[model samples]
Target: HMIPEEIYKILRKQRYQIDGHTAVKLCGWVRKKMLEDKNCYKSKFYGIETHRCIQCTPSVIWCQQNCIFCWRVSQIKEPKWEEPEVVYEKILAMHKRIIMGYAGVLDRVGEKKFKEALEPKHVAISLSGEPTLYPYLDELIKIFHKNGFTTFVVSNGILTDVIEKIEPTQLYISLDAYDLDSYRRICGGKKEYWESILNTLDILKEKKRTCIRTTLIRGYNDDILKFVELYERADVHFIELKSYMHVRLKKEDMLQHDEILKLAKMLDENSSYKLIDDSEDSRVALLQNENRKINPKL
Candidate 1:
């Protein structure tokens, strides 16, 4: 019952040049890669296939800010406060439908083998849309946990009440830009939303298993010292500094690969955070403080 025409239109508008059949094929390719690729299957922390839980957005289409780096279709639509009320049964059904494509491969490995390799796959609710804006987020997470899946909700930090209410396996705040003014420039966010984000960050600092992530753009907010200040202020468990790739919905000229290396070097020189790991394939640099080794789990 998936409407290919509607999907194709959305994809095309988002600058992804793929037909309905091709889009379906691409999804199949992703599934194949997750199952067949050694890197994807072996990784413990962030591997896609090993992650039994699927990342999804509760709202099919809605967001607070129109970020320059977003890959979603740019359409003028009103924010629906309560359209998609994700109940427990409905959430589980949606998860099953999305993950069903991978069932064959998971089944082929045999129950015993799968059980041995079983790690509770965390479902990161961050693929698209403002997940916090979903009316029944708290209930949704409860449902996910009940179904034996760990929930990790990603929030834009605009909705503090929603962030405080939901209890997730992990909570991620996308600190895309350093300051309020910079955030407004990069994300075109409402001025009041900036204060909301700061407030949310303060709240998340005390939360268990909280993480702050930033996407380093070439000519925008790549200052090392600024990043250091932001990190020091937030003081979350982990900081994921990632390079901004020239993906759909981003300005082409801004995706200078050379800038990423420069930013990496700057982070190394300036910040107290050490470069623990680097993913060249994903173009991301993982940074952690020496203190993190003490807790290890956080």
Candidate 2:
């Protein structure tokens, strides 16, 4: 999936932290918590110590779907090939440098968290593009596990075949629709991709630590009951209900805060999964209790 040189040049400004096949950027949440005072909802929903988490993507700007809610740039690129070790090292080295500035805030983070931050405890593979596009994802994940890091992958679920092959610490497949027709309208991809989405759910039928993330867009796909059967079919342990964050324009499909909880409540009441957590700060709801301790918001 090598990107043409001409295409790379054209998209360079929009994409940075380029390695052989991967790219990275210090996430805004990392910048906020370590330097400023904003807290990332990830720390609340999951138990990641924000100061010790590094967000990056192996495939910088390539994906199968063009979801309406995605914040990534519209421009797309094909992935380039690279050995897992080569790209992995480059990503971690760049990540270390990006967080080096946080050392000055050691007093606030305290020695324990500060030292952990320097070491990096978790890696969220949701930085930019769909991470499954990287062909060597399984090996990359193996490498991260070997290096004493927890790996979480946020995928759009086009490559369920590839997903079943890899072992992420936690695998999150994002869903924006309750059915294929809504899937087509919201994600805007080929008809085959719609099949791929359902296939991914079928594959997830066997995982213990899996999550299905649904972005709640009110007018677009708000029928919560429509999703229960599918969520049941997948057998995922957790579900996340998140309101779409407006990046460019206001739309009626975006949910109000109360609606987010209403969706979460429906899932909790109707399904085996219960309302375990939520972050009003991020307009997000998480089902099934996970890492119990809350790291105080920075």
Candidate 3:
């Protein structure tokens, strides 16, 4: 009900509705892996089975940041949040239906992988909006775990209070801007929101698993020192430096894979984070902190 007709129509073309405010969508990487034997950067970086992952969101159209590079529509329209249990059940049912639609390529993907895809075990709470805006996010993660699914929650880190309270398998904070000036110019964020993101970084040490993801645009806030300063503030386990791709929202300053790697290496040399892995096709780099003694199981 909260989604307006114009926006709802647009979303329906790409997403499968799970409820009034929740949705499930097929990931391109899933199809690529099934048909062409490819993998998403997440698969190589963190061992996430692309086919076994359900890309979904509990809040479809509620994000504070109107990031210029974002492909999805960013707006605020709060529906009556669904119960965590109801959302969970509906997501699983809808995911199965989406998976079944892939049966035409059963021969290519192989029966064994196709069968495993139906019983997905990973939930990426980042298909559209800022999932932390969903009030029941903490409860939702608990339910996901109860059902033996590992959850990945991605946030813009504007909601510090929510970040402090929720615990997911991997908590990803997208640090697109380093300071208030860039936050407003690049992310369409406010001074208060930028401050709250800093507060969010301060609390990342308390979480079991934490990652800071920064998207680099060529002529924008690609200042390596500023990003490293923010990364130092958060005692995170992983840092992902990614290039901003030109997609639905047209932007001129797209960074190349080589540029991304150079910046990542600069950060690695200047900080405690070590340059470990990178995917050339995805145009992203992954750095890990060996100091953090955590044995993460995918």
Alpha-carbon RMSD of each model: 5.7, 4.2, 1.8
For each candidate, what TM-score against the reference?
0.74, 0.85, 0.95
- Best of the two (1, 2) by TM-score: 2
Give the C-alpha miss distance for residue 283 in model 3, angstroms: 0.8
Better of 2 and 3 by TM-score: 3
Worst 10 residues of 3 by lDDT: 68-77
lDDT tens per residue, model 3, 165-197 = 998999999998988888887888779898999
Model 1 Cα RMSD, Å? 5.7
For candidate 2, report its TM-score: 0.85
For candidate 1, which ten residues in a row score worst on lDDT?
Answer: 17-26
lDDT of 2 by residue, 1-298 (tens): 3655654565466545566557767766776776565678888766677777878888876888877776434454464578899878988887877666667767765666556667888888987778888888889999999998888889988898887888787889988887778987788778898788888889785654688888877677788878888887777767888888775336665787788898889887887667877888778887873332222222
Those runs of model 3 whose alpha carbons end farther than 4 Å from true positions after fitting are: 15-18, 71-76, 248-252, 293-297
Residue pairs in steric clash, candidate 1? Answer: none
lDDT of 1 at 232: 66
Model 1 earns a TM-score of 0.74
Candidates 1 and 3 compared: the better one by lDDT is 3
Clashing pairs in 3: none
lDDT of 1 by residue, 1-298 (tens): 2224675477556433231111111132234445553343114234444434454556544678878787534454433333233344444454445445445777654454344333335565775668776677787777777777766777887998888777787788888887778898788898889888888877766676666778877667677568677676666766666677664335653534445556756776786666665565555666665544324232
